[PDB]
Amino acid sequence: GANRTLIVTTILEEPYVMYRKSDKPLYGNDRFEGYCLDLLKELSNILGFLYDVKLVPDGKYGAQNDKGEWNGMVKELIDHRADLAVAPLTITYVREKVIDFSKPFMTLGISILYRKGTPIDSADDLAKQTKIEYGAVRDGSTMTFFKKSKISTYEKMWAFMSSRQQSALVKNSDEGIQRVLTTDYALLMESTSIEYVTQRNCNLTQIGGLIDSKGYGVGTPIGSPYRDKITIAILQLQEEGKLHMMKEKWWRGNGCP
Amino acid sequence: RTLIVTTILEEPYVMYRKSDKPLYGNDRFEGYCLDLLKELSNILGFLYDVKLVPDGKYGAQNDKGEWNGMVKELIDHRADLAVAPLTITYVREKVIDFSKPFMTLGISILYRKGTPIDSADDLAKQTKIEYGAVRDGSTMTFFKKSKISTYEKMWAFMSSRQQSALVKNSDEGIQRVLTTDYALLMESTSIEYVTQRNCNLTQIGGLIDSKGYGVGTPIGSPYRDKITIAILQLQEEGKLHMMKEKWWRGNGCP
Ligand SMILES: N[C@@H](Cn1c(=O)n(Cc2ccsc2C(=O)O)c(=O)c2cscc21)C(=O)O
Ligand SMILES: N[C@@H](Cn1c(=O)n(Cc2ccsc2C(=O)O)c(=O)c2cscc21)C(=O)O
Ligand SMILES: [Cl-]
């Protein structure tokens, strides 16, 4: 409706959403910059909606209580306190049962963060061996995937990183990067994050194809009239190659040898 | 409830099961897509009859804007689902409803092993090694419409000389890679299926132009959300990974 302004829930995450810096006072949506803002601007332009960006108040993506209770941007959608979530919000089984997702505007998975010029080319290569230690941030989506996987190779990798846990499982992504940087360690991690780090640590590389295929989708409340239009606009933008440039724009470092 | 599912003959998604005796109905077919179908059938609780798309097309538009293929069968409500490697695309999604992708892919390179070529850029910066795509296919289209300069450069190369670098179809392209110093740009799934069966070939570089296959339904279908969710379940159960490995794995390339 022409009257209505859509509330867009989102979350602070480099480089999707960041407070912008400026020599002049900023207001409203203008206070933010980033990939997700560009995406939003493009979607708004195509669909004709006006929007109002609000950080999710608990600052979480959206997970479920041991007691079936949701938080994060997911909870905002369920309660119709937001019309859209535009953020690196992973499409998953549990989430898709409580809210509606547009098709992925970004497609990703788990990948390997490691050094250059080694025989290592895949998870399989990692799994087939023990001399180079590999792992994940403790209790991350990446680690959770391995823990829960019924796929032989991954089952083997989990046994590995759980067996060496004090070593193999790191506190957070920062410490994990340092491990790769400081040790003969390979870090499994959400591919997009790996790609960001790679553009800024010239002696790091992203190894292998993508494991655990998944996408980021714009979240909507079940039944939302906008979801379908948003899928179409996303595809339009992929068609025009515009998503690739947006990715490029916000992921690019300042050069790498 | 019984659903009509349109699909299309395609290795290794849909194939004639080989048997000494006569086979009937759904039992005639096997492949990655019949496995997915059975698997979504069990989660959603539906019966289905597999119907090969009569014109044997995926689905595209005339200059009039008339559709064909499985896409047309959906628009006309002659199928309830299309379960096949149907690429989710902008123009298709305007006329049919897609589930979220059960397989993600992109464009990659098909070449021989043991050369220094590691990327499209390595191919682009050079002329001894010929490279191309199938004429009029999605790969060519992508390359033709691309504003990325490396790709613009590759495109000018491919299309030069009455397009001697293009080929009529992927079988011809495959053979050309096999018998000639020639690299083939193509849909990565088919590339992987080929490398599994030609030990001296490989995929060069990574994926470009990300995209995915979804189960098509007619606009407004109640099955779309239910299949999306079944697809996510199967992904998390790791069943998609197993289905993929089952049908893609060759006989070992030692
Ligand atoms: N997409 C996620 C949020 N999310 C996310 O989980 N991770 C993964 C992660 C974060 C700390 S450890 C860890 C791991 O994978 O081991 C991201 O890297 C990320 C970048 S943008 C949004 C992200 C979501 O929808 O919940
Ligand atoms: N997904 C497509 C159908 N389709 C497809 O286009 N290609 C690629 C291709 C075929 C001839 S040229 C060409 C190219 O990449 O240049 C496939 O390899 C494929 C494997 S299963 C379904 C497939 C569709 O929805 O129309
Ligand atoms: Cl962290």
From Swiss-Prot, chain A:
Modified-residue entries (Phosphothreonine), positions: 198
A Gene Ontology molecular function term of the record: glutamate-gated receptor activity
Glycosylation sites: 3, 203
UniProt tissue specificity: Expressed in the olfactory bulb (at protein level). Expressed in subsets of neurons throughout the developing and adult central and peripheral nervous systems. In the CNS principally in the medial amygdaloid nuclei, medial habenulae, pyriform and cingulate cortices, and Purkinje cell layer. Also highly expressed in embryonic and adult dorsal root ganglia. Expressed at high levels in the trigeminal ganglion neurons.
Transport found in the keyword field: yes
Extracellular side: 119-257
Cellular component terms (Gene Ontology): dendrite; glutamatergic synapse; ionotropic glutamate receptor complex; kainate selective glutamate receptor complex; membrane; neuronal cell body; plasma membrane; postsynaptic density
UniProt subcellular location: Cell membrane; Postsynaptic cell membrane
Keywords: Cell membrane, Disulfide bond, Glycoprotein, Ion channel, Ion transport, Ligand-gated ion channel, Membrane, Phosphoprotein, Postsynaptic cell membrane, Receptor, Signal, Synapse, Transmembrane, Transmembrane helix, Transport
Cystine bridges: 202-256
Post-translational modification Phosphoserine, affected residues: 162
Family: Belongs to the glutamate-gated ion channel (TC 1.A.10.1) family. GRIK1 subfamily.
Protein name per its UniProtKB record: Glutamate receptor ionotropic, kainate 1
